[PDB]
Amino acid sequence: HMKVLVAEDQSMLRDAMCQLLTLQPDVESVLQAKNGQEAIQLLEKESVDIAILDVEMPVKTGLEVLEWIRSEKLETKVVVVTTFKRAGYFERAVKAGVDAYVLKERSIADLMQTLHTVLEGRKEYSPELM
Amino acid sequence: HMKVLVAEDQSMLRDAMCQLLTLQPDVESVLQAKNGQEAIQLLEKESVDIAILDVEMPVKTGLEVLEWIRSEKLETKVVVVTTFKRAGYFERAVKAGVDAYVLKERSIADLMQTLHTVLEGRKEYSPELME
Ligand SMILES: [Mg+2]
Ligand SMILES: [Mg+2]
């Protein structure tokens, strides 16, 4: 069922995730964006159930895209991914009602857990990032 | 199914919440503690699925009771409740492996989600209390 958007600037990273997702039985389609600006462009014309957004992206960060989604009040869960703690990003994301904020390099099994979790209306934070 | 304990020092809030919880079909029964000590005494006697603990209680606080529950390695899920974001609390609750740390003033609908959430081993934290 899920319509997923994946925003990630590092091309290998982006490909690995979109493919792992595309091959999940629970997934219907997976849009791609190289940076924060493409993600917004796509979200301006297309419908998404979950946006998986990396934080450090060129032009628009994942945090800035999250903030736009909320300002535009879209029916979209937002899963922000990151690798480094290195933040104030947490407060900022939590202040933006991010549906989850989790490690980027986790198992596709773990990512699907997150995806369902936010679909059902709950939230998930990778402790390491707290 | 749920065997619940509620520890709340304000007597009208304790009756309100306990009566509301009892009217829920998912909730089986609710023990009741007027402070942190009554809570522990009750915890070491009866089985309890989830304890809903006020933080600001006389004698022993919610946080103390949480720490005791863990030092006993009880198989109880802990929901801590409060109204004030008080420096140091969220952390201390989270280092003790609290299952939820949420606002007291919420719908029973909301509270029930919290209850289910912690049974399934997940976490919930009210944003207004995170730090
Ligand atoms: Mg990046
Ligand atoms: Mg109190």
Query: Which residue in the block uniquely carries the two structure tokens 């009892």?
Result: B22
- Map residue A62 onto helix, strand or coil: helix
At A58, list the tokens: 């060129």
Judged by CB atoms closer than 8 Å, whether chains meet at B94 and A130 is answered as yes
Pick from A9, A30, A3: nearest CA to A104: A9
Residues in CB range of B13: below 8 A, 6 or more apart: B104
Query: Which residue in the block uniquely carries the two structure tokens 């493409």?
Result: A38
- Map residue B16 onto helix, strand or coil: helix
Q: How was this structure determined?
A: X-ray
Phi, psi (degrees; rounded to nearest 5) at A93: -65, -45
A9 labeled part of a ligand binding site: yes
* Angstrom distances, CA of residue A78 to CA of A36, A61, A93, B82, B95: 13, 13, 10, 27, 27
A-chain residues near B122 (CB < 8 A):
117, 122, 124
Residues of the binding site of B for Mg(2+): 8-9, 54, 56
- Map residue A39 onto helix, strand or coil: helix
Resolution value (Å, 1 decimal): 2.2
- Ordered by where they begin, the domains of chain A are 1-130 (3.40.50.2300)
How many residues in chain B? 131
Is B75:B32 a contact under the CB 8 Å cutoff?
A: no
CA gyration radius, chain A: 13
* Angstrom distances, CA of residue B77 to CA of A32, B5, B83, B116, B121: 40, 10, 20, 10, 8
Residues in CB range of B106: below 8 A, 6 or more apart: none
Residues in CB range of B4: below 8 A, 6 or more apart: B21, B27, B28, B29, B30, B31, B48, B49, B50, B51, B52, B115
* Rounded Cα–Cα distance for residues B117 and B120 (Å): 5
